Amino acid sequence: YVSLADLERAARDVLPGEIFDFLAGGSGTEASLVANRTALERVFVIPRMLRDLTDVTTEIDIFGRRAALPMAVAPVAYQRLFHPEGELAVARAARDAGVPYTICTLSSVSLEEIAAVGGRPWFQLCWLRDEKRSLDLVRRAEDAGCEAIVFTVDVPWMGRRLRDMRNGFALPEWVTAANFFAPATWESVEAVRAHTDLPVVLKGILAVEDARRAVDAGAGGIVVSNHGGRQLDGAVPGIEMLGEIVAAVSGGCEVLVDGGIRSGGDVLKATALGASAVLVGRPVMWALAAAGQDGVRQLLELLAEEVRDAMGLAGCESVGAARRLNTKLGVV
Amino acid sequence: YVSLADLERAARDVLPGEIFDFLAGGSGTEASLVANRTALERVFVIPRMLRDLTDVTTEIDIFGRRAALPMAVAPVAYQRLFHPEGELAVARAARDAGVPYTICTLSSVSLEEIAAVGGRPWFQLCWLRDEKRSLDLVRRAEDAGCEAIVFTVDVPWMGRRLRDMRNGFALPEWVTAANFFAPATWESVEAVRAHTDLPVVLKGILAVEDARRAVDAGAGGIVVSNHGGRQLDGAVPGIEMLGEIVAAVSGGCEVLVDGGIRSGGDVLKATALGASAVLVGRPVMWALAAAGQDGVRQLLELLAEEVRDAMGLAGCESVGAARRLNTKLGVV
Amino acid sequence: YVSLADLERAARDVLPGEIFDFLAGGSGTEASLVANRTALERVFVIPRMLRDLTDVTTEIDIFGRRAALPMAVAPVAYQRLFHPEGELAVARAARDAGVPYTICTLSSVSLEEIAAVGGRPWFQLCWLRDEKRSLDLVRRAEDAGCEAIVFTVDVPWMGRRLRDMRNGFALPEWVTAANFFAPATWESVEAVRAHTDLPVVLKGILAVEDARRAVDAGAGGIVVSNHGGRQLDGAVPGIEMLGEIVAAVSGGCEVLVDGGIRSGGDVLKATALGASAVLVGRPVMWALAAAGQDGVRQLLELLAEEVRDAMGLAGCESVGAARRLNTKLGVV
Amino acid sequence: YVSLADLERAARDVLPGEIFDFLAGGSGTEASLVANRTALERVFVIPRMLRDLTDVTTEIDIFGRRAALPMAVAPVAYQRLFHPEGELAVARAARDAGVPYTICTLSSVSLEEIAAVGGRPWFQLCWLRDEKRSLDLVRRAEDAGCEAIVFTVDVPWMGRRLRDMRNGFALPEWVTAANFFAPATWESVEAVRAHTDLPVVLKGILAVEDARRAVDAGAGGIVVSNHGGRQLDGAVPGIEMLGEIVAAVSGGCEVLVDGGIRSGGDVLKATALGASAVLVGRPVMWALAAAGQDGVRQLLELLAEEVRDAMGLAGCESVGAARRLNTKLGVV
Ligand SMILES: Cc1cc2nc3c(=O)[nH]c(=O)nc-3n(C[C@H](O)[C@H](O)[C@H](O)COP(=O)(O)O)c2cc1C
Ligand SMILES: Cc1cc2nc3c(=O)[nH]c(=O)nc-3n(C[C@H](O)[C@H](O)[C@H](O)COP(=O)(O)O)c2cc1C
Ligand SMILES: Cc1cc2nc3c(=O)[nH]c(=O)nc-3n(C[C@H](O)[C@H](O)[C@H](O)COP(=O)(O)O)c2cc1C
Ligand SMILES: Cc1cc2nc3c(=O)[nH]c(=O)nc-3n(C[C@H](O)[C@H](O)[C@H](O)COP(=O)(O)O)c2cc1C
Ligand SMILES: O=C(O)C(=O)c1ccccc1
Ligand SMILES: O=C(O)C(=O)c1ccccc1
Ligand SMILES: O=C(O)C(=O)c1ccccc1
Ligand SMILES: O=C(O)C(=O)c1ccccc1
């Protein structure tokens, strides 16, 4: 594979149609899904030349750990839908690549099993029925060695995925929520923050004042995100809010972004707009569906090469230098 | 049906071509018809997270009545063109859904019959030949229990609908104006205002100074509208003037908008731009053509679900909160 | 015919391909040809409502004559290419419609014959070899009763029309320049101005300072124009410069525009941007090719109806009112 | 041939697919390749009228030599890929046309042989392994009569060309680097500047501060360029940075641009945005592939005619006048 798009076509061949649709789809008319790509494609980088590139490194420090790339695997529920080894295959490849892996509340393998793979994983939280049960998941994750709590804050309930409705899609018998909901509020965030010493990362922030409030609330990071266009149809892409949010936060927390990152060049664009790091969702599942653990390994090796390539061509010996790049909006 | 677009395809199958064209078409090159959709698609919402959604309500108070949604059925003449029960089917479904229904001057069932359905209806006025006859329609409507007069102000005469011309379209023998024209002016508006205690709503305002003058003239509301692209071809979409008009009116009257509203997400966009409520026209007729009263019921139930979904995903427990959402223009 | 586009299709059937290409084509990649349409389509009118329309008139006074519409027939050379009656057919229809007709220097019927048709015609000048011969054409035109000199100022030489090159197109034996070149300069303009009491109109102005200089030079009007995309490929559309030019001239001369005017709605857009009047070129030749004099009559009757329709729907009882309309740029 | 596009189609027929792909392709998704064209197409010229065109000249003085056009042949490696006479054919045609030719470090004919053709050539430098060897190439070029050193500064390494990867493309046995790499830095530039009295031209500048630093570093010129979209995928087109860079440099060095120049009209656009001259790459190779030396001659004759045509139609008797033209961005 020489691009991430090679993997999508590979995954479309192997996966049952309704499972491919569950993976690919968005809510409503899929306007926000498409806009995630359109918005990235409008961004152009202004590269710098003639800088010292003797020691180009793509590494970052985030949430107390060195990562090999400014990237983590996004939370994607029920990964056994895509391959029999599910989350274990993905976590093993992420570990080997030096990339953080986000364990889901709705993982199809238990969080303790996935954490035992190693690789200093993160844990994504869905707010439950009950403050007490929510906090027990958090404590489980922490006890198992997870290093950050990625609190999903854009799912008071799940969006209307019309492909799934039309397909009559439901979980197969053989896929379960192996770790086993009410709308989260700022009170929920405070309950989590008080219950753990781990950094709390709020995933799904788009409004500038919600980013500011996240810092005020003691968040260690946010993910600027419209949930891959799967939640509010018509929600602005995260990439379009990122610059404004980075300015408003003024270094008070890590600012990640996701939605449609499909190459090292896209990672460079996100960094140039001010992101600390990106999450990548669907492409990791394409790789998993296509070729299991080895597929995810190949994807991460490709992304690593593309990120190094893009950084050097843009005159950046470090991710910090890439954040100081300027950009220009074009038309496509 | 899981989207409004499902209903358009259903209606295209059942309706005679020339009747579908009468319904779907615009004036001239249909530039303003298409622009109504293009303009909505360019609007993106910036949703808020982590707000209290224990008691989400889509209700509003408007013109002295509670409505179940920030939506009314737009005036559409001659509804027996689309189904034998015509206006009665639509008014019954609107009543049952808690949605105001606008009775037309050119209704194919008499306004008194439609009003007897109940549901606290509105009445749309075409200015007639004669101040005295115009005012008699208004008095009839008021006597029959209509709760607002929706004065159409963008039809000094009807626009040039080229589909209708090419089709040689005319009313069938079996469809008549059951309630049985000169250009309206500001004098006409004053005559109506002096003749009724009902709120007068001016439908078809696009210029900011006409919105201001509407308030000065004693209007209780306006509908920011290019008449679904059926009047001046090249008229700006209402959705593109809405923000400016809401600012200029500064709460002096209700500001509604119509043109291309095709989902709860579109309703959210209109509200975020400052609308009090929307009108929906063609989709209600698609539902009527497809399945009569039950079709319109299903459409309104779908819209209700989509509006609740969109509001909650955007962190809005009330329509007032949705009006305080910010937006960002994108490219499509 | 119910639109101008009906006539283009009619003309494509009857005309030899290479003659249709001579008519339709532009220079280079035809970027400026296409941009004339794209630019008009981006303009939206903000119509006014509820104004007195008891005496709507589309008439204007220009260059000392009343015209029935804010429109004249553009200069198009060699009209016998399109119909055997050529310029006589077009001039007769223009006369009957009350529309000025521009007689070309390269007319295929002599200017005296065309002037004898009546209808108070204009005369378009190509600068010749020789100040003396150029001025003799001007004097001929004036002696024959022409009422304005339309000096073409954007043709120091003719543009590169690649359709014509590829077709190997040349004038048929049966078409000649019946009135029988060097680049014009500001000196040429002064020579013409000193030689006639007729208003001199400079056709092909796009730069704001050239519009200002035209007024300083004693021009009675200008046509803001890129010559229908037939001269510099990449020249900005006139419609995109019109507002700026109207502001700069501040009433010092008439400001006309041409390029892609294809409906009464387009005329309204041009007027709302500040034009005194428009020229229409290719559509008049479509009508001529399709049905001779009667074709041109039908075209002008259609345009008259569309202009009246658009003005009234926009609340304008006069062309002066239409010039005070505001506009908004959209996306298409 | 009547356009440059005629030559691309001619070249596609004759060349092996993988060689055509090597020539045509870009890096990554080819976003920057496409954007070079999209950006030029958005630029419109505001032409001037009625100026003296008695002595229109397309000549410029640059780097101490008169050139017949504001254009040079871009450096393109390995020209024997496209025709057996390779660089000699192109250099002979450039000489005969009065156009500078850029001899490549990776030329498939030795730089001394190509220089012996005459025509006062330029030499493009790839920074080598070794300051000493790099400087020896420079001295060779200077000794052979090259008149400028075009230091490529946007290739710390080569970009990822996916067409080449997918094709498994490599140099044929019969093509070699007849003159026979480390990332260049500002230190490398200074080493070159100190080693030659020839003007040093930095090719591949996009950031305004890199243009400023180039002047500070003693560069005689820069080429504002994203390397034809072959290096960083997502790099802004040079044409989009050109105006800002010309303002920042304030006459301190020559500012050239390349990327997608495909007509004399495009040359005019570049000049109107402030360029001293353009480079043309792929079209010269199309002409070479299509018809060898005579093909390149025909291409340069066509470009000369198109540049003269465009300048005169825009009222410019000299390239300096063309630089004073204004432009307007449109939509396409
Ligand atoms: C199939 C699927 C399942 C997902 N499950 C979750 C989830 O459980 N929790 C969460 O916060 N986000 C979830 N997401 C959202 C992703 O974390 C991510 O925000 C989104 O996919 C955008 O990134 P992408 O374009 O790289 O896929 C899911 C996305 C997909 C496609
Ligand atoms: C078939 C049809 C008939 C209409 N009749 C009327 C009418 O009698 N009075 C009026 O004010 N608007 C009338 N309208 C305009 C609508 O009230 C509304 O402004 C327009 O359809 C835009 O909304 P939509 O895109 O939701 O259809 C009509 C529209 C249609 C399509
Ligand atoms: C076939 C043809 C011949 C023309 N001949 C002339 C001419 O002789 N003099 C002139 O000033 N313009 C000439 N024009 C330009 C037109 O007057 C006008 O500026 C142009 O066609 C743009 O208007 P349109 O889009 O309505 O055709 C010609 C245009 C065409 C298509
Ligand atoms: C096949 C090919 C080989 C090239 N080789 C070089 C090179 O050796 N050195 C260099 O500085 N640029 C090289 N370039 C870049 C060109 O000089 C030029 O910047 C680019 O092609 C953009 O111009 P165009 O759109 O006119 O082709 C090459 C381009 C192509 C297509
Ligand atoms: O988060 C999601 O987008 C998603 O599709 C999902 C669906 C079911 C359970 C958890 C997440
Ligand atoms: O209002 C309309 O758009 C419309 O189409 C119409 C047609 C006839 C009578 C009333 C309204
Ligand atoms: O003016 C023109 O555009 C044109 O096509 C023309 C061609 C020959 C003679 C006069 C005008
Ligand atoms: O510069 C280039 O773009 C290019 O394609 C190339 C490839 C091999 C050697 C030198 C240049």
**Distance between CA atoms of residues C233 and C245, nearest Å:** 21
Q: Which atom of ligand 4 is nearest to the CA of D225?
A: 19
- A108 — phi, psi (to 5°)? -90, 0
User: CB–CB of C180/C140 below 8 Å?
Assistant: no
Is the CB of B190 inside 8 Å of chain C's CB atoms?
no
Residue C235 has what DSSP assignment?
B
Say how many domains are in chain A: 1
The single-letter code of the amino acid at C212 is R
Handedness of CA A209, A215, A218, A222 (dihedral sign): positive
**Distance between CA atoms of residues C202 and B134, nearest Å:** 52
- D222 — phi, psi (to 5°)? -135, 155
Neighbours of chain D (3+ CB pairs under 8 A): A, C
What is the domain extent for residue A172? 4-324
By CB atoms closer than 10 A (0-12, 13-18, 19+), residue D148 is buried
Interface contact B153-C47, CB threshold 8 A: no
Interface contact A184-B47, CB threshold 8 A: no
**Distance between CA atoms of residues B9 and B286, nearest Å:** 8
Q: How are beta strands A149-152 and A122-125 bridged, if at all?
A: parallel
3-state secondary structure of C204: strand
Interface contact D234-A45, CB threshold 8 A: yes
Is the CB of A329 inside 8 Å of chain D's CB atoms?
no
Interface contact C328-B236, CB threshold 8 A: yes
Q: Which atom of ligand 1 is nearest to the CA of A102?
A: 17
The single-letter code of the amino acid at C181 is F
Q: How are beta strands C326-329 and B149-152 bridged, if at all?
A: unpaired
**Distance between CA atoms of residues D104 and D65, nearest Å:** 20
Is the CB of A104 inside 8 Å of chain B's CB atoms?
no
Nearest to A60 by CA among A332, A285, A311: A311
**Distance between CA atoms of residues D41 and A15, nearest Å:** 42
Is the CB of D331 inside 8 Å of chain C's CB atoms?
yes
| Token representation of residue C304 | 């008259």
**Distance between CA atoms of residues A99 and A92, nearest Å:** 10
Q: Is the CB of A106 under 6 A from ligand 5?
A: yes
| Token representation of residue B185 | 């002016």
CATH number, residue D129: 3.20.20.70
Select from C43, C49, C331 the Cβ nearest to the Cβ of B42: C331
User: Which technique was the structure solved with, according to the deposited record?
Assistant: X-ray
Q: Which residue has the tokens 């009857």?
A: C14
3-state secondary structure of A332: coil
Rounded to the nearest angstrom, the gap between the alpha carbon of residue C108 and the centroid of all alpha carbons in its chain is 18
Q: Which atom of ligand 7 is nearest to the CA of C155?
A: 1
Handedness of CA D199, D204, D206, D207 (dihedral sign): negative
A146-168 b/e with 16+ CB inside 10 Å = b? bbbbbbbbbbbeebbbbbbeebe
Please tell me the number of the ligand nearest to residue D81's CA. Answer: 4
User: CB–CB of A63/A148 below 8 Å?
Assistant: yes
Instruction: Tell whether A127 is covered by a domain.
Output: yes
Q: What are the strands, taking DSSP E only, across chain D?
A: 43-46, 60-62, 65-67, 71-73, 102-104, 122-125, 149-152, 200-205, 221-224, 254-257, 277-280, 326-329
3-state secondary structure of B282: helix
**Distance between CA atoms of residues B265 and B286, nearest Å:** 19
Distance from A225 to chain D by nearest Cα, in Å?
22
**Distance between CA atoms of residues A265 and B97, nearest Å:** 50
Q: For residue D279, what are the β-bridge partners?
A: D72
Is the CB of A230 inside 8 Å of chain D's CB atoms?
no
Contact partners, residue D320, CB within 8 Å, separation at least 6: none
Nearest to A266 by CA among A31, A36, A24, A17: A36
Is the CB of B314 inside 8 Å of chain A's CB atoms?
yes
User: CB–CB of D127/D147 below 8 Å?
Assistant: no
Helix then strand then coil, in percent of chain C rounded to 5, is 45, 15, 40
**Distance between CA atoms of residues B165 and C309, nearest Å:** 15
Tally the residues of chain B: 332
Judging contacts by C-beta atoms under 8 Å, the chain B residues touching residue C304 are: none
Contact partners, residue B241, CB within 8 Å, separation at least 6: B206, B207, B208, B224, C46, C328
Interface contact C51-B236, CB threshold 8 A: no
- Angle of the A208-216 helix axis to the A238-249 helix axis, nearest 10: 40
Nearest to C323 by CA among C285, C270, C283: C270
User: CB–CB of B36/B283 below 8 Å?
Assistant: no
Distance from C327 to chain B by nearest Cα, in Å?
8
Nearest to D36 by CA among D286, D270, D311: D270
Give the CA distances from residue C152 to residues C124, C184, C216, D273, in Å, rounded to whole numbers and listed in that order.
7, 8, 18, 27
Rg (CA), chain C: 19
Give the CA distances from residue C203 to residues B2, C154, C184, C211, C254, in Å, rounded to whole numbers and listed in that order.
57, 7, 12, 10, 12
By CB atoms closer than 10 A (0-12, 13-18, 19+), residue C131 is middle
- D329 — phi, psi (to 5°)? -80, 135
Distance from D294 to chain C by nearest Cα, in Å?
21
Q: Which atom of ligand 2 is nearest to the CA of B152?
A: 11
User: CB–CB of A95/A67 below 8 Å?
Assistant: no
Select from B31, B166, B233 the Cβ nearest to the Cβ of C2: B166
Instruction: Tell whether A235 is covered by a domain.
Output: yes
**Distance between CA atoms of residues B182 and B156, nearest Å:** 7
Instruction: Tell whether A329 is covered by a domain.
Output: no
**Distance between CA atoms of residues D77 and B128, nearest Å:** 79
**Distance between CA atoms of residues D32 and A204, nearest Å:** 31
Q: Say how many Å lie between the CA of residue D255 and the centre of ligand 4.
A: 17
Instruction: Tell whether A245 is covered by a domain.
Output: yes
Neighbours of chain A (3+ CB pairs under 8 A): B, D
Distance from B282 to chain A by nearest Cα, in Å?
18
Q: Is the CB of C106 under 6 A from ligand 7?
A: yes
Nearest to C281 by CA among C322, C238, C320: C238
At CB < 8 A and 24+ separation, what contacts does C176-181 make? C176/C108, C177/C78, C177/C106, C177/C107, C177/C108, C178/C107, C178/C108, C178/C109, C178/C110, C178/C111, C178/C113, C179/C105, C179/C106, C179/C107, C179/C110, C179/C111, C179/C137, C179/C140, C181/C126, C181/C127, C181/C128, C181/C129, C181/C157
**Distance between CA atoms of residues C221 and D25, nearest Å:** 51
Instruction: State the DSSP string of D73-128.
Output: EPP-S-GGGT-TTHHHHHHHHHHHHT--BEEETT-SS-HHHHHHT-S--EEEEPPP
Is the CB of B87 inside 8 Å of chain C's CB atoms?
no
Give the up-direction half-sphere exposure of residue B325: CA atoms within 13 A in the CB hemisphere: 37
User: CB–CB of C279/C260 below 8 Å?
Assistant: no
Q: Say how many Å lie between the CA of residue A258 and the centre of ligand 5.
A: 15
Interface contact A310-D189, CB threshold 8 A: no
| Token representation of residue A240 | 């379009």
Interface contact D165-A269, CB threshold 8 A: no
Count of C-beta atoms within a 10 Å radius of residue A286: 29
Q: Ligand 3: which residues within 6 Å by Cβ?
A: C 22-23, 36, 74-77, 104, 106, 124, 152, 203, 225, 227-228, 230, 258-261, 279-282
